[PDB]
Paper text:
The camelid single domain antibody, referred to VHH or Nanobody, is considered a versatile tool for various biotechnological and clinical applications because of its favorable biophysical properties. VHHs have typically similar structural characteristics to those of human VH domains, consisting of four framework regions (FR1/2/3/4) surrounding three complementarity determining regions (CDR1/2/3).
The SPR analysis showed eight‐fold lower association rate constant and 50‐fold higher dissociation rate constant, resulting in a 350‐fold worse dissociation constant, for 7D12‐Vob compared with wild‐type 7D12. The results showed a dramatic decrease in the melting temperature (T m) of 7D12‐Vob (52.2°C) compared with both, wild‐type 7D12 (63.6°C) and Vobarilizumab (70.9°C). To gain insight into the molecular basis by which CDR‐Grafting diminished functional and physicochemical properties of the chimeric VHH, we determined the crystal structures of 7D12‐Vob and Vobarilizumab in the unbound state. Interestingly, whereas framework‐2 is covered by the long CDR3 in wild‐type 7D12, as shown in a previous study, 25 framework‐2 in the chimeric antibody was exposed due to the extended conformation of its CDR3. However, the significant difference in CD spectra among 7D12‐Vob, 7D12, and Vobarilizumab suggests that the conformational change in 7D12‐Vob also occurs in solution. This structural change is likely a critical factor decreasing both affinity and thermal stability.
Numbering used by the authors: 1 to 28, 31 to 126
Amino acid sequence: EVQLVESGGGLVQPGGSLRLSCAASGRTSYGMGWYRQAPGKGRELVAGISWRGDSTGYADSVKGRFTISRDNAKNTLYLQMNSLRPEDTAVYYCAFAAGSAWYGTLYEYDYWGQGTLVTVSSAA
């Protein structure tokens, strides 16, 4: 089915910007999300988009700073990250969300990218 390759991570000063890319080599899904996981913390959904692209959601903490978009033709998902804060430091993952059966229930069967590290530090 599908391989997701992420790029665009890096080290930036507070207030800096990065653009993450999630290139889907192949095809399979209900939608597409960007997630992030900092050490000791869970994998937070920070931005989500529908197929038609007019349903976008954002975590409260990234509203007005992050923008999710898709290029149909390039099969590529993007996250534009502006006004980055130390607390945005995490590994960022793209996922294509599918469904699968488990003992009478549905669970989210995700196609996961490998992750791209974002570090926001005065050291940058």
